[PDB]
Design a protein around this ligand. Sequence first.
Ligand SMILES: NC(=O)c1ccc[n+]([C@@H]2O[C@H](COP(=O)([O-])OP(=O)(O)OC[C@H]3O[C@@H](n4cnc5c(N)ncnc54)[C@H](O)[C@@H]3O)[C@@H](O)[C@H]2O)c1
Ligand SMILES: NC(=O)c1ccc[n+]([C@@H]2O[C@H](COP(=O)([O-])OP(=O)(O)OC[C@H]3O[C@@H](n4cnc5c(N)ncnc54)[C@H](O)[C@@H]3O)[C@@H](O)[C@H]2O)c1
Ligand SMILES: NC(=O)c1ccc[n+]([C@@H]2O[C@H](COP(=O)([O-])OP(=O)(O)OC[C@H]3O[C@@H](n4cnc5c(N)ncnc54)[C@H](O)[C@@H]3O)[C@@H](O)[C@H]2O)c1
Ligand SMILES: NC(=O)c1ccc[n+]([C@@H]2O[C@H](COP(=O)([O-])OP(=O)(O)OC[C@H]3O[C@@H](n4cnc5c(N)ncnc54)[C@H](O)[C@@H]3O)[C@@H](O)[C@H]2O)c1
Ligand SMILES: Nc1ncnc2c1ncn2[C@@H]1C(F)=C(CO)C(=O)[C@H]1O
Ligand SMILES: Nc1ncnc2c1ncn2[C@@H]1C(F)=C(CO)C(=O)[C@H]1O
Ligand SMILES: Nc1ncnc2c1ncn2[C@@H]1C(F)=C(CO)C(=O)[C@H]1O
Ligand SMILES: Nc1ncnc2c1ncn2[C@@H]1C(F)=C(CO)C(=O)[C@H]1O
Lengths: 430, 431, 430, 431
Amino acid sequence: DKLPYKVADIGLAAWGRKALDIAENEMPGLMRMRERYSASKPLKGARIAGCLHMTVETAVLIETLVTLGAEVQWSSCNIFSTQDHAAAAIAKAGIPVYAWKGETDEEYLWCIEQTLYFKDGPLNMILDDGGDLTNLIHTKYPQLLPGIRGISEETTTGVHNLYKMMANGILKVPAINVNDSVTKSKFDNLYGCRESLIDGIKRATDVMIAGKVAVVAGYGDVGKGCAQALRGFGARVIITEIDPINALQAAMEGYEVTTMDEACQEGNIFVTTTGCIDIILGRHFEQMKDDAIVCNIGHFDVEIDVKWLNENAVEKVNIKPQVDRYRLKNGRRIILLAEGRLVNLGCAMGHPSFVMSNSFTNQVMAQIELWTHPDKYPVGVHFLPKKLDEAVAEAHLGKLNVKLTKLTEKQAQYLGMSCDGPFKPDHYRY
Amino acid sequence: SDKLPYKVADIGLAAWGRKALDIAENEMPGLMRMRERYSASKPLKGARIAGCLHMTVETAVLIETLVTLGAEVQWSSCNIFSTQDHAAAAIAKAGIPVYAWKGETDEEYLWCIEQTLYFKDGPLNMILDDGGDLTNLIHTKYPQLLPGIRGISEETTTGVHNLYKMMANGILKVPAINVNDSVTKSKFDNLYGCRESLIDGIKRATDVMIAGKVAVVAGYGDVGKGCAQALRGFGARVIITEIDPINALQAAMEGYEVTTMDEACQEGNIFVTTTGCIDIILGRHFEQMKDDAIVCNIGHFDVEIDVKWLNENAVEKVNIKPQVDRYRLKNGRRIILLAEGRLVNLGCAMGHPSFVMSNSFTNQVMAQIELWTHPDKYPVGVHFLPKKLDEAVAEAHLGKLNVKLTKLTEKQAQYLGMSCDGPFKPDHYRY
Amino acid sequence: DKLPYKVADIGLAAWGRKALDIAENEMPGLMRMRERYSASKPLKGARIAGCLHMTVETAVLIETLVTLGAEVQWSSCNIFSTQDHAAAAIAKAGIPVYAWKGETDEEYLWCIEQTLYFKDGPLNMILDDGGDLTNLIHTKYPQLLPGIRGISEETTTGVHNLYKMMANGILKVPAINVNDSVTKSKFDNLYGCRESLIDGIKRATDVMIAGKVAVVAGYGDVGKGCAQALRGFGARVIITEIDPINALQAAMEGYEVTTMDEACQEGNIFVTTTGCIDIILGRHFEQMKDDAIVCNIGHFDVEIDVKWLNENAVEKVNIKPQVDRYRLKNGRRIILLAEGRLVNLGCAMGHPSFVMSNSFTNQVMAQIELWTHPDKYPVGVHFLPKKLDEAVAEAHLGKLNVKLTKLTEKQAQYLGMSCDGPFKPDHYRY
Amino acid sequence: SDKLPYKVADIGLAAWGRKALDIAENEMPGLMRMRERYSASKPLKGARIAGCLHMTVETAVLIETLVTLGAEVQWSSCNIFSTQDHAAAAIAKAGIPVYAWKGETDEEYLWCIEQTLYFKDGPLNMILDDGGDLTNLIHTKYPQLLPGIRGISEETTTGVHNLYKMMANGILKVPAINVNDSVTKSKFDNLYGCRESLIDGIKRATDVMIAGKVAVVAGYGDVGKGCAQALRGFGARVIITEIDPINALQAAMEGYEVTTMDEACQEGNIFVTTTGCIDIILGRHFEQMKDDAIVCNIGHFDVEIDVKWLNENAVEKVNIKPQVDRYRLKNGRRIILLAEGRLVNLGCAMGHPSFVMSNSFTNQVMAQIELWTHPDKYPVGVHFLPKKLDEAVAEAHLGKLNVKLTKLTEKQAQYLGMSCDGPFKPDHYRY
Ligand SMILES: NC(=O)c1ccc[n+]([C@@H]2O[C@H](COP(=O)([O-])OP(=O)(O)OC[C@H]3O[C@@H](n4cnc5c(N)ncnc54)[C@H](O)[C@@H]3O)[C@@H](O)[C@H]2O)c1
Ligand SMILES: NC(=O)c1ccc[n+]([C@@H]2O[C@H](COP(=O)([O-])OP(=O)(O)OC[C@H]3O[C@@H](n4cnc5c(N)ncnc54)[C@H](O)[C@@H]3O)[C@@H](O)[C@H]2O)c1
Ligand SMILES: NC(=O)c1ccc[n+]([C@@H]2O[C@H](COP(=O)([O-])OP(=O)(O)OC[C@H]3O[C@@H](n4cnc5c(N)ncnc54)[C@H](O)[C@@H]3O)[C@@H](O)[C@H]2O)c1
Ligand SMILES: NC(=O)c1ccc[n+]([C@@H]2O[C@H](COP(=O)([O-])OP(=O)(O)OC[C@H]3O[C@@H](n4cnc5c(N)ncnc54)[C@H](O)[C@@H]3O)[C@@H](O)[C@H]2O)c1
Ligand SMILES: Nc1ncnc2c1ncn2[C@@H]1C(F)=C(CO)C(=O)[C@H]1O
Ligand SMILES: Nc1ncnc2c1ncn2[C@@H]1C(F)=C(CO)C(=O)[C@H]1O
Ligand SMILES: Nc1ncnc2c1ncn2[C@@H]1C(F)=C(CO)C(=O)[C@H]1O
Ligand SMILES: Nc1ncnc2c1ncn2[C@@H]1C(F)=C(CO)C(=O)[C@H]1O
């Protein structure tokens, strides 16, 4: 028969629950969503199958969907991002969770497949982060497509895929771009990585940032956070970019912008925030400085040629889980973190719960949208109404004791807008 | 026939003005690159552009860029105190109809704007505005010229806000290009520009120290974002007010305290309004403020600080120097007003530096050229420049800063599904 | 009998030895000390008894002392700062070490006492951090005093104790104030906590810093470092000081400066860097927002009234090691870290090895000076010559690839100084 | 006798200077607290103080403070460009012998100082120096006045440096107090002061964009730290140069790149010498600078930049405006020099704001009182002020910033072993 779940140690449920209690008090968005849409169960009948890093933050989201009458089955969208105590807590809660830190490509695939069919029917809703789930159903379980009502993508890379599929006509089910919600990409990607990247490098290497020259590939919302994080600790940051705008942004901020070919000979730390392949190749590792720390924080491990290292390094010693130190022919060494997988989740705990509350509340609203108002979202990737976006940030103001100002009638008139309604044009960039 | 060829404060300043223009030029690669690339082409040939933008050394460079492109131009400042006399003299000497000077009166203001409407041979063809003052003047009092204008290009947030309002009500009769909302503008001019000019205007006017003082910044948009950081960098504790939950959540995540003006008015030692909205600082606030609290506005129109109240309420009002008034209230405390409520950077200083302005002005030039040569592509309404152009404005400036951009390899351009030259971000990207 | 050592599990030696390999490459100072005095063996005959946080950095220290021909016996200066794999590595190398994470007061004392007598006589030198060792001997083993050639403190609180002792003429052995060495106090205390403070709060709680209000008690080198870290992550930092000079500095940096009686009402995060007692009391706890994180970074755990919480809280749950969460009679909760002990070392790994190389390079120099030139240092607390101070700083320039400028003959004569000798007046504050 | 009672640019500027002083006094609590406490006691009665320090608004308040304490003063500036005419006017109108104006010549500089040696009642009693020129004039040309001078007061590092080199050679014949190395001075005036005044000078002189530029700051001392932090706060990439391994590591730990001037001279866009040393920027360096590179100095004396070389090698030299010259080398590239090498914060601006200057001048007034009231407490040499006085200086400025200082309790003070009022730090503390 099938397994009710599959975690590393159900025994961790105790500790994991203690952590969920703490994260809950830090995620007012998800809690404000609970108490409001609990007595109504707007997701009643929904059989949500999610694929997202099984962490304490995700655990609070999973229970929130449930609190809303939703039926759920989960898996982690990465073999190294799962938090066993958090996964156990959910497992103990009676939810079908299939994840654990340190899964093999095989087990990873298997884990997702275990969330495809519920006790009484296949999935009708999707909650993805990376696009791995949707890709599996569209390429291996097409039969389910018409059965699935909607989708909600979490990250940049996953959303990049959706548009691609829609533009090629491969996408056969509606989908809401959660990553590009203002209260997401401008907070999660930016502030979330501003605090999580350094944590991943720290727990893994304990290296001192100050005095070190760090190279950040790409200056998007993620790279902006990483660069700021490193600079704030006293590190000289260099940036690489392909977009003249982003590149000019980094320059206006006092960052040096050059190519990886030149920068590889200066960096003491390397972070890839690009969403594309071949960012750091052997040509680069060969010129690096002894004991240069290298990691990737992008969604997919396709930026650092970890393969070249294994097939070219003279020695390969593992310091501890997710931390390896290669020795090249030149005699110098290289430090690889999480085997190239997103370092903040692989070597640490990912973004703190507060910022995650922002993303996850967008996620919940999205599920409620593709499930309650299918007519508003036909086959194609859509954005969540700016009215809801503003609402998400609104829910997180109180905790920070922030006092929002209210537009008077005269003022609302003068500006031509509702003191309650949206405050910015859809094209606004924040 | 007695229409003056120009009208500045002192033609003698042209010499010193030209000097500043040569230096500024070597800071504005965008514009200069637009000249060498379109000088012989003369895309703006036949066009008669009538602009209404702050007559500064940076604007002068834009005026000559348009002229180098075979465009007939007549200019006027869009704010009574923003004009730089030596800059107007230089242009006035170049033989261009200039009507602007520091210290204009409401009367003279409107006058100047009207002295640019008719060129020696025909009405205006295009409208280069900043604030909407020109666009509105025509639409209401000179509607007969509407069908003779191939398009408008708005410079700032307030002006562009006005256009949309007109289009919504269908009151907008001539096409328009939203320049302010071009990434290489709003996210640069509004942000990095104010970050260096605000303190500049306050410093030149009061010389007050920022380190240690508490500063209140009304609004946290692109201008507020830059103002807050400028203040913060100098050691001042910044407090922000906001109506937008998102914007407010942004300032909090940046270590800023966010509250209402009603409460911040009792703490502030320096106040800066970055809102395009009225009624920000009122008597209620002035009465609570601290002794010698500095008050100023950096928004387009002087509709944020109720200066009228200060005039009709202070026990006395002294003038330390031009654009700097020190009122004394009944409570015995004093208040320092800058530029009589007008945008402080330009009113008390010299506005954004030349390098950054090159960005916005290059977008302005691409707008004129676009709205002029390709009118059969811009219906009646407000539009944005193609991201290809927006991106072009950025790259044109990388050189100066010696920025070495990376080129996508063939494999990468495929993996990402985009041209190694074509647009790099979707239309919804927020940078 | 006398155990040859005592650690948590010597099976961690392999991992500890690896952690040292990496560390040795991050501490140029200590390594330049070995290659320069290896054959010289200046510390020959010296029986050094050390009492300092048994960590990866401290391990590289001990091994340096040994390379210089000294005999060493070690113990930690705190019950929670010991890093087991680092303590194990040292134990396996034959170096007597009595330290493990999670000691008790009884075992703490016991550990120090195992380092008093060597396999061939009582201790010669005292490498202490906090005064526990120098105080233990001056009060229980005065007969060993005349046999001790010198003492070298490490931290502020400890050096303070030394002065207080000399003043009352209780100090019966020449000591060198290492902490107040420029390359120490202005780097270790400052940049060190700037990276380690947040590190300790995160591994323990994973809380988001951005948005929170943080109250840092005190504004000294440590206070400065912590404060900068917190606001670097987007937290609003409120300071509390008793020294008007330090207070003006904070205000000139943009920090609000009030009393704890005031701040205890706004703080979401509390960090005490004061060197004294009674900073956060029950009166304060009763007013902290729900789930306020309170920790201490001062040497001794005398800044936070942890007893009060235990005898007044209506609930107390242990999330995990060094992480307790209480619930007051008012219903609001409080998260205490390391039971009030220095959090950076109790909840993390202390400062990164690079900045510690600075501190420890001075420590070794202090041991050599005191042991090699006993006469040159009579009974009392002394500083290290500025020529030596600059030497330390200059030894780490290479690693960061810094190009120091050499004064020309003309320039040197103009400035009235040697192009090699001291570059600053003795009262220079940097 | 023809000795003029004063000599200023335009005493008709006094009206405006007085206004400036009004605002200034309200920003200098320390200086006003001094008079507010000794106005009656008149502790400086009988003192004939001759001060040689940048005649500015801040300095004006300093002078009026001493006068309020019963001292008699004749003043002169210690730099040919740091004088602010309207300020020098106010003091003049107030009936105080002041010889200084903006634009002086070496000859007039020497003259201006000598006019402050003899008072109506005879030779000077006290010295208030900044740079040491006055103390050097007396010691070398008027050694017969030495036995008549009680004490000296050095404001800046350079001067203080001279006092030691003098005492060391035993050529210092009068007790002097090192005011610069007082915590409330060097760790506030040099650091935070320049952090706000360096840019100000650069801006008013050039209006250049700081964001995106590469800046090179020679020296990482109290001034270097301040300047560097300011520049990068605006988005400039700051490269540092140093000869002291400690300072060098400090800058490196702050994320600054530290190389040699020989290298940085090839990639800098803005140069700022904050060293008190010679030969920092030479012709070999100029010849490698990027086009239109702005070069300036903020060190006391103009000896860091080889301005002489520029005049004797450039093929073109155009003066844009006072204190702003643009050269063109044989390599075809241009170079913007400010204030001809003199301290740019005062040469092209208004120096440090009034607030922080209060910290410096408070120690100044304090030193005078000490040196004049307790002469026996200071043998021949150079000393610092008691730490308890330093704390008092800072504490006197907490009020305006609204800082709530904390008081040690009985138990606390006992545990720490220090008076809940007495000095809080050991003599060697570095803050
Ligand atoms: N680990 C996390 O917590 C987290 C959080 C959010 C997003 N992400 C991931 O981060 C990535 C992208 O960042 P964003 O999400 O900030 O998106 P952008 O902001 O979409 O991201 C990438 C940036 O890199 C640049 N770039 C692309 N190819 C490059 C090359 N070869 N060299 C140099 N620069 C290049 C682009 O011009 C762009 O500015 C995705 O993979 C996304 O899924 C991770
Ligand atoms: N002086 C200059 O150099 C310069 C340069 C660019 C723009 N501007 C002007 O600055 C203004 C707006 O800034 P942006 O940055 O252009 O636009 P947003 O970024 O459009 O601007 C205003 C911000 O203020 C907030 N706000 C609105 N009403 C408020 C109220 N009553 N209280 C508190 N906050 C309120 C909004 O939510 C928004 O975040 C316009 O007037 C524009 O023309 C001046
Ligand atoms: N955990 C670590 O890594 C580390 C590293 C270095 C020092 N320390 C410890 O930090 C402490 C002191 O810091 P420093 O930075 O070493 O020394 P200072 O800089 O000597 O330290 C304390 C500061 O707190 C202030 N202060 C004292 N009592 C106060 C009170 N009741 N309220 C508010 N402010 C008060 C003082 O004015 C002073 O500025 C010592 O206990 C020292 O051993 C810890
Ligand atoms: N204009 C102002 O407002 C103001 C205010 C305070 C001090 N100053 C002046 O600033 C100067 C010194 O600064 P401080 O900050 O006073 O003193 P430090 O802090 O004494 O000053 C200089 C620093 O430069 C370094 N240095 C010396 N020679 C060098 C060389 N050839 N190359 C590279 N680096 C070198 C030293 O190692 C030192 O750290 C003096 O001239 C002083 O009078 C000006
Ligand atoms: N602690 C965390 N818990 C859950 N999800 C997280 C966390 N930190 C970051 N993420 C997400 C993650 F990985 C990516 C990019 O794929 C996102 O865009 C985020 O939503
Ligand atoms: N120095 C300057 N020169 C010319 N135009 C400037 C300058 N500084 C700011 N601005 C413009 C200005 F005023 C507004 C808002 O109305 C803008 O949005 C800018 O383009
Ligand atoms: N990782 C570390 N390893 C060893 N010692 C450290 C570390 N981080 C900080 N310290 C010391 C510590 F604890 C105190 C205060 O007592 C100091 O002053 C430091 O030398
Ligand atoms: N606004 C100002 N007013 C008076 N003196 C000032 C000012 N700004 C800086 N200084 C002094 C100055 F010039 C030097 C270096 O010689 C110092 O060290 C300062 O005290």
